[PDB]
């Protein structure tokens, strides 16, 4: 009934070289995701350091994602959120214009809208495009929570709104959502609990770990969607150590560190206020990484 | 260090037909000036900085500087960002337009580490030569500037002279001033204005003063005169309005109160902010009846 974007999805890191987006590396990383079973890529989300990219760089990375996924089954679910509704509408329209298959739209950060404000915020976004819109709830970062009732109202009232990427450590809410609106696409935004969310009827993940181990996250998700819960849980259990250490510091500081340690990106560069991890954390990530196979290019 | 302290107002930004009501904006600032306020903070959190365009940001700062010219009232311009390159640009811009200093909120959403926060604010401080007030509000940003990081920034960077705390953490307020008594601690939470001042805080950046500038200014000046009995008296009297003004997320209640008092023409916000619930509207209206609201 609704057009959806589900399955194993990757919140792409944005590699920097000499303070600019390494556009070749970016395309190479997306191709590596495609070749390891990923179903969709999320350019310029939180893991992609959307906050510190210019509007032009925002467009460059979405376009590279769109162009790299052409001729494949992999879709582009472009990050396009804002805590200003007029800007979120503009970003949604840009992402559509750029060939995105849908948008991921984070709940307004910092200004703490009410549930009524969130409803009007996302309705305005939904009314701006004709492509699928996935809500994104991460209260630890935004200071706000999209209630289950607000999500279900948006799902029922807006054709393009088809689900939510939950990063809230709240499996109760995941039960709440799918028990009252079983038609929505619940997407895990927290790698450590990928399997419990999938096993409750979630239909995908938007993963940080998949930057480093796309084949494992892909296999986990597809096992779960095929109702092979025993095989899905084993991979989820296997990934717990890496899933946790990748948040030793604020994402994407650890995942970019791991990608650099694996030789998958050429420079450990961030955009301030993000910075390199502590020495202690650098070493801890390297230690956890040694227990996993990291696919190359 | 050059400082900006005393009674300060986080100015609301009135909208009329979807645009900044610049006449209303200037008129509200004059009312603040005539009511004993020492500085105004354009386009802070209470001013809906997040939903203003870059031009609206420039325009309200210009109106503030320019309206306070020839008065002793200073302009502490909101200029923070969660991208350091942008926060540097906003700081340089604010300096260029005659602001006396800047309020720079800790990066929201992307949760920098303490090292990143230090480098973030270090870059800002070195880009201008006007005072820089840190702004810690972890409930909104998802990050905390630790006491150690604030003190390091105060000691390492000339322009950084203090912090506006909106953290409900009087322990931290003791921590800050016991280890670095030279910094200017500024209250960002109206209900506890007096406890912060009585511990050596040197000012407030107030939401309530939009509605009751004379009372907040008088409270602050009593406290700075070490008339703690009178400062506390006002703080106690203001608790009810101070509390109801956060019934919903600021500035939803304060704009509701300004509208109810006849001080602004329309209860307009920019999405994702919206009108309060019918219930909250009525609660704000009821609490207000116990306070005397200065007109224009
Ligand atoms: Mg305390």
Q: What is the DSSP letter of B178?
A: H
Token look-up 């500024």 returns B186
- Helices assigned H by DSSP within chain B: 22-33, 54-67, 84-96, 114-127, 138-141, 147-156, 170-179, 193-198, 213-224, 228-237, 239-244, 252-260, 278-288
Structure tokens at A102: 């849908």
Tell me how far apart the alpha carbons of residues A70 and A58 are, in angstroms, rounded to a whole number: 19
Residues from chain A that touch B113, judged by Cβ atoms under 8 A, are 249-250, 253, 275, 277-278
Structure tokens at A126: 């939904």
Tell me how far apart the alpha carbons of residues B60 and B11 are, in angstroms, rounded to a whole number: 10
Residues from chain B that touch A128, judged by Cβ atoms under 8 A, are none
Hey, CA dihedral for A49, A54, A57, A62, is it positive or negative? positive
Token look-up 């309200």 returns B60
Tell me how far apart the alpha carbons of residues A165 and A105 are, in angstroms, rounded to a whole number: 9
Q: What is the DSSP letter of A47?
A: T
User: Contact A85/B277, CB-based, under 8 Å?
Assistant: no
Tell me how far apart the alpha carbons of residues A238 and A192 are, in angstroms, rounded to a whole number: 10
Tell me how far apart the alpha carbons of residues B78 and B99 are, in angstroms, rounded to a whole number: 10
Residue B55 phi, psi dihedral angles, 5° rounding: -70, -40
Q: At what angle do helices A171-180 and A148-157 cross, to 10 degrees?
A: 40
Tell me how far apart the alpha carbons of residues A62 and A80 are, in angstroms, rounded to a whole number: 10
User: What 3-state class would DSSP assign to A53?
Assistant: coil
Ligand 1 centroid to Cα of residue B165, in Å, is 12
Give Cα separations from A230 to A174, A201, A220, A225 (angstroms): 20, 15, 10, 12
Structure tokens at A11: 């919140």
Give Cα separations from A184 to A125, A154, A172, A174, A245 (angstroms): 18, 11, 16, 11, 31
- Where do the structural domains in chain B lie, given as residue ranges? 6-230
Q: Quick one: which of B2, B101, B83 has its CA closest to B42?
A: B101
Token look-up 């953490």 returns B169
Token look-up 């602050």 returns B220
Tell me how far apart the alpha carbons of residues A208 and A46 are, in angstroms, rounded to a whole number: 10
Q: Which residues contact B73 (CB under 8 A, 6 or more apart)?
A: B32, B33, B37, B38, B39, B40
Tell me how far apart the alpha carbons of residues B31 and B295 are, in angstroms, rounded to a whole number: 8
**How many CA within 13 A on the CB side of residue B12?**
33
Token look-up 């007096």 returns B194
Count Cβ atoms below 10 Å from residue A157 Cβ, excluding itself.
12
Residue B147 phi, psi dihedral angles, 5° rounding: -55, -45
- Clarify whether B243 is annotated catalytic: no
**How many CA within 13 A on the CB side of residue B152?**
14
In chain A the first and final C-alpha atoms are separated, in Å, by 38
Give Cα separations from A246 to A136, A249, A294, B182 (angstroms): 20, 7, 14, 39
For an interface test with B, the pick among A111, A256, A279, A280 (most B C-beta atoms closer than 10 Å) comes out as A111
Q: What is the DSSP string of A176-230?
A: HHHHH-TTSEEEE--GGGHHHHHHTT--EEEESGGGT-HHHHHHHHHHHHTT-HH
Contact (Cβ atoms closer than 8 angstroms) between residue B202 and residue B224: yes
Tell me how far apart the alpha carbons of residues B289 and A150 are, in angstroms, rounded to a whole number: 34
Burial class (CB in 10 A: 0-12, 13-18, 19+), B145: buried
Residue burial B180-216, b: 16+ Cβ < 10 Å; e: rest: beebbbbbbbbbbbbebbeeebbbbbbbbbbbbbbbb
Q: Across the strands, what pairs with B206? A: B9
Q: Are strands A185-188 and B39-41 parallel, antiparallel or unpaired?
A: unpaired
Contact (Cβ atoms closer than 8 angstroms) between residue A4 and residue A185: yes
Token look-up 């009524």 returns A116
- Clarify whether A26 is annotated catalytic: no
Dihedral-angle region of residue B162 (phi above 0 means left; psi in -120 to 50 means alpha; beta otherwise)? left
- Resolution in angstroms comes to 2.1
User: What 3-state class would DSSP assign to B224?
Assistant: helix
Fold of A7-239: TIM Barrel (3.20.20)
Return the residue of B nearest to A84 by Cα. B51
Structure-determination approach: X-ray
For an interface test with A, the pick among B271, B276, B279, B280 (most A C-beta atoms closer than 10 Å) comes out as B271
Tell me how far apart the alpha carbons of residues B116 and A288 are, in angstroms, rounded to a whole number: 24
Residue in B74, B152, B164, B202 annotated catalytic: B164
Which of A106, A273, A277 is the closest to B119 by Cβ? A273
* CATH among 3.40.50.10860, 3.20.20.70, 3.40.50.450, 1.10.287.180 for B6-230: 3.20.20.70
Tell me how far apart the alpha carbons of residues A115 and A93 are, in angstroms, rounded to a whole number: 24
The last residues before gaps in chain A (C-N over 2.5 Å) are none
Q: Quick one: which of B230, B121, B134, B259 has its CA closest to B188?
A: B134
Token look-up 């804002």 returns A82
Hey, CA dihedral for B215, B216, B219, B225, is it positive or negative? negative
Q: Quick one: which of A297, A287, A217 has its CA closest to A265?
A: A297
Contact (Cβ atoms closer than 8 angstroms) between residue A203 and residue A7: yes
What is the distance in angstroms between the Cα of A18 and the nearest Cα belonging to chain B?
Answer: 15
Residues from chain B that touch A46, judged by Cβ atoms under 8 A, are 109-110
Tell me how far apart the alpha carbons of residues B39 and B32 are, in angstroms, rounded to a whole number: 9
């Amino acid at each position: 009934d609704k057009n959806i974007i589900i399955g194993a999805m990757t919140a792409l890191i944005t590699p920097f070289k000499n303070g600019k987006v390494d556009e070749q590396s970016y395309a190479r990383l997306i191709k590596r995701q495609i070749e390891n079973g990923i179903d969709a890529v999320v350019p310029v989300g939180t893991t992609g350091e959307s906050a510190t990219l210019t509007a032009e760089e925002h467009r460059t990375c979405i376009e590279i994602a769109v162009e790299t996924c052409k001729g494949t089954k992999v879709k582009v679910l472009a990050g396009a959120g804002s805590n200003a509704t007029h800007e979120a509408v503009g970003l949604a329209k840009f992402a559509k214009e750029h060939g995105a298959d849908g948008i991921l739209s984070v709940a307004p950060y910092y200004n703490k809208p009410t549930q009524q404000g969130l409803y009007e915020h996302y309705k305005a976004i939904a009314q701006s495009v004709d492509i699928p819109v996935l809500l994104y709830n991460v209260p630890g970062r935004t200071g706000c929570e999209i209630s289950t009732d607000t999500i279900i109202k948006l799902f029922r009232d807006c054709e393009n709104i088809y689900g939510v990427k939950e990063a809230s450590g709240n499996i109760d809410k995941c039960v709440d959502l799918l028990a009252h609106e079983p038609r929505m696409m619940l997407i895990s935004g927290e790698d450590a609990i990928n399997y419990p969310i999938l096993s409750n009827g979630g239909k995908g993940v938007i993963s940080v770990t998949s930057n480093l181990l796309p084949d494992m996250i892909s296999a986990l998700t597809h096992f779960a969607l095929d109702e092979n819960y025993k095989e899905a849980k084993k991979i989820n259990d296997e990934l717990y150590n890496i899933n946790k250490i990748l948040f030793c510091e604020s994402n994407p500081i650890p995942i970019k560190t791991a990608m650099y340690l694996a030789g998958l990106i050429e420079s450990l560069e961030f955009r301030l206020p993000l910075c390199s991890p502590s020495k202690e954390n650098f070493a801890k990530i390297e230690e956890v990484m040694k227990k996993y196979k990291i696919k190359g290019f």
